[PDB]
């Protein structure tokens, strides 16, 4: 019996997806097929142009049997948190055994090269990044030179290591390493990457990025979206559009985040996860001398940071999230496997994860505390309850920027069970 | 020499406020006259209409010689708090001898005799109001029923208690209480309000109430607006509109209250100031039910919750205004006098206010800190830094809702230097 495991985010589920995931299923013919699965924001630092519970049935009609959600403290992180946090929950169902992963060089070999090295932690290697560590290096820059300078005394190739600026093949990595740490028997396996980089902007025809995609639709060409889309992800679009749940953009946000930060001082940046290299100051300035989202992360970017890595603080910073939760985080792992939703088929490996799961199943959030109180595995409770107040929390702030007035209010998390889809 | 205070919002400055400016000045003859105003937050929980640096300049054209600032702490209150901060405000000036204030019964007499009761506290009166909020009444309903039954016990009349269910008055009784408290000599002087009440929300010509006034503006009904205001006051609300500086609703700033609120814990409002009687559930709870703030402050209201203390405690909550800290005020007061403005006539006696003054005088804001470490006079440093960081913040949100967003940038409090008018 096989179980197919992807990590993704769907932003949304375009044809480089479905290419991926049939591929996946070719490669592994995998009797079960699990996802992974950001939530409302993603790993760029923004929202989710529609609903999990959108983009959730989306997965299940394009055959994934089970979705769970990432949650939120890994989904908006950066490679190594987010990578951790997804293989922490697909190792956690029990049942997951391979995982297919996008990739630019396509050669799992070098993958789980670096990955060992990382793991492994060799004495050469420490020595390199503790020097690269000076000379005022940013961590995955000392990193890869420290990588780089490992590879000439092994006598390999030292040029590959510069493959490592590609997004799929750093996660890639970090899959893999995580996997190492918590002793994982996952199998890994990589297909060579669908269609336009993840960051293209530009319209390909068949296959656009998803980036691209979203920019689409803030033009409304919505004939070019349909050509980039399978068809049961734009009806599905179309549907949380015309229902007043779509789409959402980042710039929607943007007068809250930027109003928020100007009620903050620097004392309040410095407690919040990721930020060091000044850019406690850099938010603190920024937000009082520009008058727009926009302008903000302009006047914060510099030669050093990636808009992505400014967003995602931004993020960071309105659900508070510190720098202490994180690091437990990072430690432990998400401490619940939250399902979105399932196919008659995933009902089936559902049944079965209830006896093999490492974490405790969470399906009706109205029992989740329930289901706290009565789990027998030794979960941090203390951490289980702020992360998944994190999700909820993340949700009902999303919530607020649906276009129709009306999608307001509730929680959706309470409100809305796990999509339920008849094969 | 006689120098005259008086305690104002203007939000916006009417027919109203010239007719009761005017007679405060024929009443008391004055050599100067001295405004301590709210900045751009009134006691009602709403915005100024027009920001704090235009209202200045108006009340500078309408015959105040110098503007103050009322720190936002104080000016966000409760009659209390609000007359508490004004007093201490206009008595640290060291020159203030008299105050006028309008007032529906203006019974001086009756006035003083209140506070002086609020101010000694005789037992007498102690028991009757535990009594009353052992009953369960609030402390306005339990202070008014105690006070009846202490008149009734001393044979005086008490359904003359009955006065003090009129705002203005109630208010006049915390400005005279709050002398008495602080040892202030200042003469106070009641004259009787005439036009529409504050509560009034409907337009009759002149004198309608600055409430029906902005609404006036929400239905872009201009000329009756015009016909409202003097010419000053309306010449300076066009020049904030044509900039793009006005007008600014409650409404504008509607969808980030509730966004926030949705950011937060029962925990967070447990530590804001205000709350009580279950409001930190009704605020959480209904932060998650409604999706607008007008249905938000219809959720959390209720018999014993007015409006203006609901839209208050949002203010709180959004600028995180905590128990101790508003403790703190209460208890020692303003730490510094800001000017807003002056006149050329006002230099005079804004020059006797620094060799008399009892708390320093902030006019340069760029400077603030530099006067602190400097000041002889023994404020209370952290209390210092508190109150005038709110009250910078304040200014810094208030600024994201101009409606153009050419005028969103840069800190106005460091930017707009004290208005000045030859004269």
């Not at 630019?104 to 020595?127: C, G």
């Not at 996997?179 to 990457?193: E, P």
């Not at 430690?331 to 399902?339: H, L």
Request: net charge neutral; with cysteine; aromatic share 12%.
């Amino acid at each position: 019996m096989k179980v197919l495991g992807v990590v993704v985010e769907y932003n949304p589920f375009h044809n480089g997806h479905l290419y991926h995931l049939t591929s996946a299923r070719e490669l592994v013919k995998p009797d079960y097929t699990i996802a992974v699965m950001s939530g409302n924001f993603c790993q760029r630092g923004e929202p989710a142009v529609i609903d999990k519970f959108a983009r959730a049935e989306i997965a299940l009609r394009m055959g994934v049997d089970v979705v769970l959600e990432l949650p939120v403290v890994f989904a908006t992180q950066d490679a190594g948190g987010f990578a951790f946090g997804a293989v922490c929950v697909l190792d956690a169902t029990g049942v997951v055994t391979d995982v297919v992963f996008g990739s630019e060089s396509n050669d799992i070999e070098f993958l789980q090269r670096v990955a060992r090295i990382l793991y492994e932690q060799p004495d050469e290697y420490q020595k390199f990044l503790h020097e690269e560590l000076k000379k005022g290096y940013s961590f995955p820059n000392a990193r890869k030179y420290a990588l780089m300078r490992y590879f000439s005394m092994k006598g390999w190739n030292e040029e590959e290591v510069l493959k490592l600026e590609k997004s799929n093949d750093i996660l890639g990595v970090e899959y893999i390493h995580s996997a190492l740490k918590i002793g994982s028997n996952i199998r890994f396996h990589t297909i060579k990457r669908v269609g336009a980089e993840e960051k293209d902007t530009s319209f390909r025809g068949r296959f656009s990025s998803a980036t691209a995609i979203r920019n689409l639709m803030r033009e409304k060409r919505w004939e070019e979206v349909r050509d980039s889309l399978p068809e049961d992800s734009f009806e599905i679009l179309m549907r949380e559009i015309n229902e007043g749940r779509g789409p959402v953009f980042l710039e929607n946000m943007g007068d809250f985040l930027l109003s928020f930060f100007r009620l903050k001082n620097m004392d309040f940046f410095e407690k919040i996860h990721g930020f060091s290299e000044g850019l406690e100051k850099r938010f603190h300035v920024c937000a009082r001398q520009t008058g727009s989202y926009r302008d903000f992360l302009e006047c914060v970017k510099a030669k050093r940071f990636t808009f992505s890595r400014i967003r995602r603080l931004a993020l960071f910073s309105v659900f508070e999230v510190n720098k202490e939760f994180v690091e437990k985080s990072n430690t432990k792992g998400p401490q619940y496997i939250r399902i979105l939703g399932f196919t008659e088929k995933g009902r089936e490996i559902l049944s079965l994860m209830r006896k093999k799961a490492k974490l405790p199943i969470v399906t009706n959030m109205s029992l989740y505390r329930k289901v706290l109180e009565k789990t027998d595995l030794p979960v941090d409770k203390q951490l289980f309850l702020e992360q998944i107040d994190l999700d909820v929390k993340a949700t009902n702030f999303y919530s607020m920027f649906f276009p129709s007035v009306e999608q307001r209010c509730g929680e959706r998390d309470f409100s809305i069970h796990p999509i339920f889809l008849r094969t």
